[PDB]
Amino acid sequence: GPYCQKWMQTCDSERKCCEGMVCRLWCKKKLL
Known part of the structure; x- marks a missing residue:
């Protein structure tokens, strides 16, 4: 939502x- x-x-x-993006403890950006 x-x-x-x-x-x-x-x-x-x-x-x-x-x-x-980054399904580790949350979702957050880690990208080139």
Whole structure:
């Protein structure tokens, strides 16, 4: 929904990761 990626959404192999980036404890950017 409206608060997930920029709210550190607690990521698991079942979590609706709003940007598909770094499913480790949250979802956050790490990219070249």
